[PDB]
Amino acid sequence: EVRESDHYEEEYVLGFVDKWDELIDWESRAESEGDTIINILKERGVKKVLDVATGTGFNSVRLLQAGFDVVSADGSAEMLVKAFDNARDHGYLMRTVQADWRWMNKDIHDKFDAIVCLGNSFTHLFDEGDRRKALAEFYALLKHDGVLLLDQRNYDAILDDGYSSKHAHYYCGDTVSVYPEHVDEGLARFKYEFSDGSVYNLNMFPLRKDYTRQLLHEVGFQEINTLGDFKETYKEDEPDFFLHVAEKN
Ligand SMILES: C[S@@+](CC[C@H](N)C(=O)[O-])C[C@H]1O[C@@H](n2cnc3c(N)ncnc32)[C@H](O)[C@@H]1O
Numbered sequence: 001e002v003r004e005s006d007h008y009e010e011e012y013v014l015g016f017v018d019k020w021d022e023l024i025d026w027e028s029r030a031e032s033e034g035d036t037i038i039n040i041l042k043e044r045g046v047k048k049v050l051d052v053a054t055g056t057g058f059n060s061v062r063l064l065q066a067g068f069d070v071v072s073a074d075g076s077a078e079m080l081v082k083a084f085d086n087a088r089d090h091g092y093l094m095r096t097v098q099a100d101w102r103w104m105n106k107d108i109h110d111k112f113d114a115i116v117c118l119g120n121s122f123t124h125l126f127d128e129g130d131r132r133k134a135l136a137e138f139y140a141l142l143k144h145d146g147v148l149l150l151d152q153r154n155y156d157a158i159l160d161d162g163y164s165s166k167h168a169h170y171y172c173g174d175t176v177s178v179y180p181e182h183v184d185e186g187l188a189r190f191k192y193e194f195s196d197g198s199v200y201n202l203n204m205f206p207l208r209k210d211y212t213r214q215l216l217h218e219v220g221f222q223e224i225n226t227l228g229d230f231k232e233t234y235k236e237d238e239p240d241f242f243l244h245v246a247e248k249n
Pocket of ligand 1: 054075117
């Protein structure tokens, strides 16, 4: 029945991350990414980190290499297998937990100095109730002085700049291009095209910057610093990403 379709959408994204990891090696990605995330955590004396969007494990492995104690959670068991084996290949024992954002402490019973939700993951929630619930679950998993690091694409530029926003964005040189095929206030569909000709189309929710900030404030975070993050190969006046640094207190 509809199990075939749900299996297809999971397999589609799994193929997407496999293609990304096939053509974009992690060392190139680590050097392109700053050490900004790591230093932010270090400056706050973070030891214990929960990654709630492990995916194939890049953020988790980077934090393990940096010396953090990391728990690697993801809603997808198949992602966590890839993440664990990638960490293994880099010489690290990952601690994987399958967990849905709407009930994060079902199987995670510890509290954390920081949570990372990176790679533009939070945009995958299309329901506002789910968005609030997810952020409340993260908030409850933080120690009193903990911090949430949560990023997203800059959807404001696409929703507002109009004709000047209808162009592709490139990552890791020219290895992948990302083109906004369709954007309205409720839905953004991007075309991802890789250097080998592979094409994937992915849906996400186009969170406005101040909306995300409003959600974070509303579930109880007391201080939110939003940083512009220029990750694309051909920089523009507007950053293509934002990084929210939300302090529980
Ligand atoms: C874009 S990937 C991020 C990968 C990694 N952070 C990186 O940048 O390399 C987003 C991940 O979040 C997970 N995810 C999406 N919705 C979720 C939910 N409701 N609960 C738990 N995980 C979810 C997906 O399984 C996927 O692995």
